[PDB]
Design a protein around this ligand. Structure first.
Ligand SMILES: Cc1cc2nc3c(=O)[nH]c(=O)nc-3n(C[C@H](O)[C@H](O)[C@H](O)COP(=O)(O)OP(=O)(O)OC[C@H]3O[C@@H](n4cnc5c(N)ncnc54)[C@H](O)[C@@H]3O)c2cc1C
Ligand SMILES: Cc1cc2nc3c(=O)[nH]c(=O)nc-3n(C[C@H](O)[C@H](O)[C@H](O)COP(=O)(O)OP(=O)(O)OC[C@H]3O[C@@H](n4cnc5c(N)ncnc54)[C@H](O)[C@@H]3O)c2cc1C
Ligand SMILES: N[C@@H](Cc1c[nH]c2ccccc12)C(=O)O
Ligand SMILES: N[C@@H](Cc1c[nH]c2ccccc12)C(=O)O
Ligand SMILES: [Cl-]
Ligand SMILES: [Cl-]
Ligand SMILES: [Cl-]
Ligand SMILES: [Cl-]
Lengths: 516, 516
């Protein structure tokens, strides 16, 4: 069979230029690649927080180190997501916060530290789980960098960046390596009688043909949904939010510092993101229109940050779910045309490069063997649905009952069999999936991370954070007193490292300025 | 809740003494353990070939290195299973053999070598897959040891040993660390009204009580099947054999050497194992009674080895399948009381220590939380059924059509959805699950190996061995000429290592004698 020669990508958002870059790199330029993007249709404007596989799976693949891309996109550091006012009905006299951290919780004689922490917690021990089991949370409270001043990394971290700058950076990289950029707008899609895309008609009269079409057209799904008619599985029975009101907000970095993490601040009818970088943070109130109007959500958002009635806003609506199939006939959807999940977990951009990695693993010839797309499709379903379930677990575990929105989350959601089973095992005292690798190995073995994406420590962070603990510590530990004492030694080490980091890390602000 | 204090194990076979040892070790002797075994009921008499996790998961756990246990059980080395006369209707003018090897096939730029081999095979390249992709197969032909003379390991390997000696060795180890050995026979089992085992009545009038009962009673499943009435899922719709005729056969080691592997020699109505060790090999014709009588199978077995009409034999029958649930109420089945699969894959003893590892991971208190047993049960189902499918794939992939037995295997088996899907992906040219770890790391990370037990290289060995190849090499490789050339370099390295091993390894015979 003839190989794939001609590739057309529709869409010039983050997905489009990620796809163009990744395929320029993977197909050894043995490919004619054309990207078409409409001047009249703006990018979504958001997507600024990431996870550590962005470097390993995406940028390393292109041969671009952090030090090269970061300065060009207003890059900053992310060590965690901090959840504020999620656990209980909010009380301004109380500090309700917890971290969801990158990296893995150590094991002690085959048992995670989370489990030794719980046994202590049964006996009255008061310190929060993540402050016991990880050395960096206090450093994040102190707004400290993830590295020493000389660049040496001291904790696992990912990135914050400007959405527009990242796409433009990738545009320049791909165009310079022979991607053909067309500024025009696809107006019609022509299918043959067998249902494969034959060509695209544009607004300015071009007819585009290709062997492979990549749909990066955003939520409209021009090729995958509109032309090929693939069902979208709406999942508003699983998750309630459907809208966001978004803006960039100036920050007094010299007075206030730069938080080395994303915040998730729970609201009356959804939650607000905060994404610090030098000079400014991106922020957005993710909300449900069934519980609050866009007008009210806009008022709540402005009030939170003390913004003015004159401040222009990025008003977004969205549908939660994914296509029944990501790849149909000669068309692979990537990005918002494929699926969507609110950014509680910062996995939107992860879905782009994870799908691109998987497309290359299942790469077709011009005969489009359906066994390759079937196998690809099944990897996407598992990837999405597991993340969907992990996001939903924040919502059904909360104890908030102060509004109709939080009540509905407590009582009215549809839960998968898979999530119920995981919750069941947790409540019994069982660790969920654990790794014996260190952070570096885990963040370097994508076929492992891909299938083992959510680990014991991820679930513990969220569940213990929201104040839902197992019925019982692990029965085995009543037979293992020496292991319990060895775990105390490990808790003492973590505490020493926490103290060292306190007096050794530069502030995130100063470090960022030093980079530039 | 009160912890598990008293443990009774029924059964003094390999399972019983593995269980007793493993629990003596895991529960820090904070446990009263009693094993009961009947003098009138013999052990099964077989189970002599193993896989590399025997050392890592089992013996290392007990703190017993190879050099300690091997000499006491007539230990020998196993580097592979060699399949003879499996591929085609047998012709004594033809050499029909292939190896299924331990360890992992290297990757080249994210693609397994198996896939670069196939692309060469499309262009007419004649060398067999495993001789291209692994450095040891020729060494195994030459009956060479897996180590240099000074002990340095040169290939991944496992063990052969005497079944009776291993159990007796473990008996001495467990008894010396405070296991109470009772020679008596359980005649009745008493259940309360809620259905939990209350006590055992013995032939000599003892009443045994415990918090936890381990059923190692062999195929009868005295506690799990006979008392608790748990269904056995018979799987004779998946796999046809139901019997074996077995013996030990003297070997002229000085004239003939000692094969560093297990052989699987396909017969008219099943297949024969060969398990070499110093002085002798264990052998057994696994057969289906629907296709041949035990009398005929006995004649075929004797004829194969030139044995005498006076040679006494271990005549076995068995049922293929597993319990619906391995752990019910206060009783965990381990060994032949749990499940059975013919030794095509040498996983019977693997099932013992894998279940023991999983029991300790899900260890109960005296309240027997059903969520712990449910989660344990589900790990056992996945473990067994995946192995069942892997075994069945040898049978439905063969081209033999010379007997009713081989025809039935070609046409008449029930296949799981899971195996069909794997076969589908294979035929498309896709690698099945791959690892980026080396052999050592993989054989040291049990939570990884447990879930990722059968890898691309395992399936390739069997499928390519039987002469079923994919429709097509991987389309991606037509875009990657530099990777193809880099893979040629890797093929050249393997070939150099093969030559080095040829002139460097001692024979298996000599090495074994040198150990003693
Ligand atoms: C509210 C919200 C918050 C989010 N937060 C995060 C986050 O914190 N972290 C994270 O990783 N991700 C986040 N995401 C996801 C992230 O924004 C996206 O994954 C990413 O920006 C990719 O967008 P896209 O290219 O698929 O779509 P878009 O940005 O919508 O781009 C669509 C492109 O297709 C073009 N196009 C459409 N139709 C045509 C046509 N007819 N002819 C020619 N061109 C056409 C458009 O002009 C545009 O160029 C968030 C998403 C939303 C909605
Ligand atoms: C034909 C065949 C080939 C095999 N080949 C391999 C192989 O190559 N590699 C491999 O790893 N595995 C192999 N196996 C599996 C292996 O033999 C077993 O996994 C292992 O030996 C464990 O046996 P067991 O203890 O469960 O049962 P058994 O050996 O049957 O022991 C049963 C024990 O329970 C006792 N008992 C029963 N009832 C009572 C009672 N009423 N009161 C007191 N005591 C009682 C018996 O006396 C005996 O001590 C093979 C199995 C078979 C059948
Ligand atoms: N495997 C992911 C898990 C993850 C996804 N989103 C997260 C947000 C916060 C912490 C961890 C995550 C990682 O560590 O990158
Ligand atoms: N993960 C197993 C796979 C396996 C089971 N039985 C085998 C027999 C031969 C070769 C490999 C195997 C191992 O390498 O140990
Ligand atoms: Cl996101
Ligand atoms: Cl973890
Ligand atoms: Cl076996
Ligand atoms: Cl492999």
């Amino acid at each position: 069979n003839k190989p794939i020669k001609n590739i057309v990508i529709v869409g010039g958002g983050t997905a489009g230029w990620m796809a163009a870059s990744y395929l320029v790199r993977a197909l050894q330029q043995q490919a004619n690649i054309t990207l078409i993007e409409s001047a009249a249709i703006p990018r979504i404007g958001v997507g600024e927080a990431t996870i550590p596989s962005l470097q390993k799976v995406f940028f390393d693949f292109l041969g671009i180190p952090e030090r090269e891309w970061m300065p060009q996109v207003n890059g900053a550091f992310k060590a965690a997501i901090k959840f504020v006012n999620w656990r209980k009905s909010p009380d301004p006299s109380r500090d309700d916060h917890f971290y969801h951290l990158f990296g893995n919780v150590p094991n002690c004689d085959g048992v995670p530290l989370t489990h030794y922490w719980l046994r202590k917690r049964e006996q009255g021990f008061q310190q929060p789980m993540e402050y016991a089991c990880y050395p960096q949370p206090g450093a994040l409270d102190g707004k400290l960098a993830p590295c020493l001043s000389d660049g040496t990394r001291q904790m696992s971290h990912a990135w914050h960046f400007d959405a527009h700058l990242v796409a433009d950076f990738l545009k320049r990289w791909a165009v310079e390596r022979g991607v053909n950029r067309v500024v025009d707008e696809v107006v019609d899609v022509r299918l043959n009688n067998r249902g494969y895309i034959s060509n695209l008609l544009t607004k300015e009269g071009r007819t585009l043909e290709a062997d492979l079409f990549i749909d990066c057209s955003g939520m409209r799904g021009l090729l995958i949904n509109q032309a090929l008619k693939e069902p979208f599985i709406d999942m508003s029975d699983y998750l309630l939010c459907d809208s966001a009101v978004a803006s960039a907000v100036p920050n007094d970095d010299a007075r206030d510092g730069v938080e080395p993490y994303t915040s998730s601040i729970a609201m009356n009818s959804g939650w607000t993101w905060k994404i610090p970088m030098l000079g400014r943070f991106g922020s957005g109130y993710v909300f449900s229109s069934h519980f609050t109007s866009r007008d009210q959500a806009t008022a709540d958002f402005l009030k939170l940050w003390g913004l003015s009635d004159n401040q222009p806003l990025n008003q977004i609506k969205f549908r939660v779910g994914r296509n029944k199939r990501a790849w149909v006939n000669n068309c692979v959807s990537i990005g918002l045309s494929s699926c969507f999940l609110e950014p509680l977990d910062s996995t939107g951009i992860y879905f782009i490069y994870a799908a691109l990695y998987q497309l290359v693993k299942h790469f077709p010839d011009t005969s489009f063997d359906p066994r390759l797309s079937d196998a690809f499709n099944a990897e996407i379903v598992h990837m999405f649905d597991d993340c969907r379930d992990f996001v939903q677990a924040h919502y059904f575990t909360t104890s908030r009952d102060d509004t109709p929105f939080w009540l509905a989350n407590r009582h009215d959601l549809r839960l998968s069999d898979a999530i119920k089973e995981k919750v069941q095992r947790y409540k019994a005292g069982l660790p969920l999936t654990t790794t014996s690798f260190d952070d570096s190995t885990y963040y370097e073995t994508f076929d492992y991370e891909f299938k083992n994406f959510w680990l014991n420590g991820n679930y513990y962070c969220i569940f213990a954070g929201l104040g839902m603990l197992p019925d019982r510590s692990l029965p085995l530990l009543q037979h293992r007193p020496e292991s319990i004492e060895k775990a105390e030694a490990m808790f003492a080490s973590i505490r020493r490292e926490a103290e060292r980091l306190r007096t050794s890390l530069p502030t995130n602000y100063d470090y960022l300025r030093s980079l530039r």
